[PDB]
């Protein structure tokens, strides 16, 4: 038999892999699966945090303007985040998507300025180059090496029309004076859900380099490799859309046979 | 809230015999 | 529609289709109870099997299945054999063999190429049956793709029969899948399904293969134009919109 082990495991791996908007109904789902509101709640209260955090899920605090992303690199612990660019910690309850409890927190550092800069400049990228999206600038120390860590997403939900849609961006920076490494992955997803279950998911590796110079330049240097590499991203992705229109997909099936009308019943089933 | 019509699609109608596991 | 098994279909409707075999594996799993109600429910993608006897093709579903082995519609006989598998009337094979005759000259016409096989089972008052329809590429391609037709009828005669009740449940996959240097990575993949019902004429002018044949033809040319519109017009869009 399938143990409640194996069974947990189950249940939260469906949860972490809820398409973009649809957390509540495969949680539902999982729910009155298993039918144990207290096992689930237990069992699988990872799985909530992993999808937010996989996600980049964002949230606006009240008392702030600014929308942060839910992110491995802001995890605090005890169900707490980090907003960098507002220097608040704040609880966010994975379950309803809800932050609470802004915080005061203490984000100074030799790297801040570093963070700032990279901040300000990611921040008008993005304002610029997706309809809603938010970012989030992290700055850590990680192998006593400098990083810095720039999140984009951008997300449109439209349960009504059966689709929902989001875009991943992670970027890495590690600032070793004098050629800083970069590192990349962006992703897509979108599922279209009226009368079936179609998906694209899609993903892109970057690996680059820039040099390291003042921070506001080395920002501007940043930046441009950003916008250069997710403009080239989606450009090619619609080129492939296209080819697939055009070649594989008009090659599996014909829309009519060379008769150019539909089969002749009749006939085919006298020979 | 979704419609599932292959729930409602013909089934078979002799005791299937299940596979392993 | 609270039913375990409504919320098992909805989760496989919002469950990534790239990983259609495991969540339906992973499902029966969590819920062993619905095993054979998931299996006859949950389309999944067809596999190809060889005929060792007639040196042809079939497709392998849970419509032709008992146990661990299935029929094939050329031999009419499992694999691997089976003592006392489950076998349509020698009446509705006859059709059978009329059925999956007329079905492979469609895959000709309409797939030029690829693989067919039509399976049929009684019914109290008529009958059902499965045509499936499977056409690949070998994987060599820059572009892979992969066409799944999944078409499930249900006849049930009148008092006669000059007429018949149909009902079509028709289930089109649609998989395709590229690594390219600008775009890297890109899964496009997933189904769609429709149903519909008609009453027909039964007659020597019209026989049932006949009038299936239509109504098969009829859903899977229209599903072939949602598919494009979804696919390469859709989604599409929403990637766009996203940036």
């Keep these: ?271 | 809230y979704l419609a599932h019509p292959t729930r409602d699609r013909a089934k078979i109608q002799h005791s299937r015999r299940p596979p392993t596991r | 529609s609270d039913q375990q098994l409504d919320c098992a279909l909805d989760l496989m409707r919002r469950l990534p289709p790239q990983q259609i075999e495991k969540n339906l594996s992973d499902l029966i799993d969590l819920v062993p109870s619905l095993c054979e109600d998931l299996l006859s429910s949950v389309d999944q993608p067809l596999k190809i099997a060889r005929d060792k006897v007639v040196g042809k093709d079939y497709l392998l579903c849970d419509y032709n299945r008992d146990g661990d082995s299935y029929r094939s519609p050329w031999s009419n006989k499992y694999d691997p054999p089976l003592e006392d598998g489950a076998m349509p009337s020698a009446r509705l094979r006859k059709l059978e063999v009329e059925a999956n005759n007329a079905f492979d000259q469609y895959r000709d016409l309409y797939f030029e190429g690829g693989v067919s096989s039509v399976y049929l089972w009684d019914l109290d008052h008529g009958f059902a049956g499965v045509i499936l329809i499977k056409k690949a590429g070998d994987g060599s391609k820059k572009i892979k793709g992969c066409w799944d037709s999944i078409h499930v009828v249900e006849v049930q005669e009148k008092s006669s029969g000059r007429t018949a009740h149909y009902k079509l449940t028709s289930t089109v996959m649609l998989w395709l899948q590229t690594n390219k240097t600008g775009s890297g990575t890109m899964n496009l993949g997933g189904s769609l399904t429709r149903q519909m019902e008609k009453d027909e004429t039964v007659s020597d002018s019209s026989p049932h293969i006949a009038n299936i044949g239509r109504l098969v033809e009829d859903m899977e040319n229209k599903i072939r134009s949602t598919l494009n519109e979804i696919y390469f017009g859709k989604t599409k869009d929403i990637v766009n919109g996203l940036r």
């Design chain 1, 1 to 271: 038999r399938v143990s409640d082990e194996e069974k947990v495991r189950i249940a939260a791996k469906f949860i972490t892999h809820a398409p973009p908007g649809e957390f509540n109904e495969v949680f539902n789902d999982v729910r009155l699966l298993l039918n144990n509101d207290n096992l689930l709640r237990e069992g699988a209260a990872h799985a909530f945090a992993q999808y937010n955090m996989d996600q980049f899920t964002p949230v606006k605090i009240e008392g702030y303007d600014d929308q942060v992303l839910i992110t491995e690199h802001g995890d605090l612990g005890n169900g707490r985040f980090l907003d960098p660019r507002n220097k608040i910690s704040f609880k966010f309850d994975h379950l309803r998507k809800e932050a609470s409890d802004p915080q005061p927190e203490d984000t100074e550092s030799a790297l801040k300025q570093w963070r700032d800069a990279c901040d300000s400049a990611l921040r008008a990228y993005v304002k610029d180059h997706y309809p809603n999206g938010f970012c989030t600038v992290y700055g850590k120390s990680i192998d006593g090496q400098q990083t810095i860590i720039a999140c984009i997403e951008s997300h449109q939900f439209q349960p009504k029309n059966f689709w929902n849609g989001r875009w991943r961006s992670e970027w890495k920076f590690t600032i070793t004076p004098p050629t800083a490494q970069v590192a990349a992955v962006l992703k897509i997803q979108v599922h279209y859900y009226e009368d079936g279950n179609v998906q694209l998911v899609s993903h892109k590796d970057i690996q680059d380099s820039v040099q390291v110079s003042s921070d506001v330049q080395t920002a501007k240097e940043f930046i441009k490799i950003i916008e250069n590499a997710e403009n080239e991203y989606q450009t090619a992705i619609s080129e492939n859309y296209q080819t697939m229109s055009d070649t594989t997909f008009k090659a599996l099936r014909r829309q009519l046979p060379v008769t150019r009308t539909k089969i002749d019943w009749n006939k085919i089933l006298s020979y």
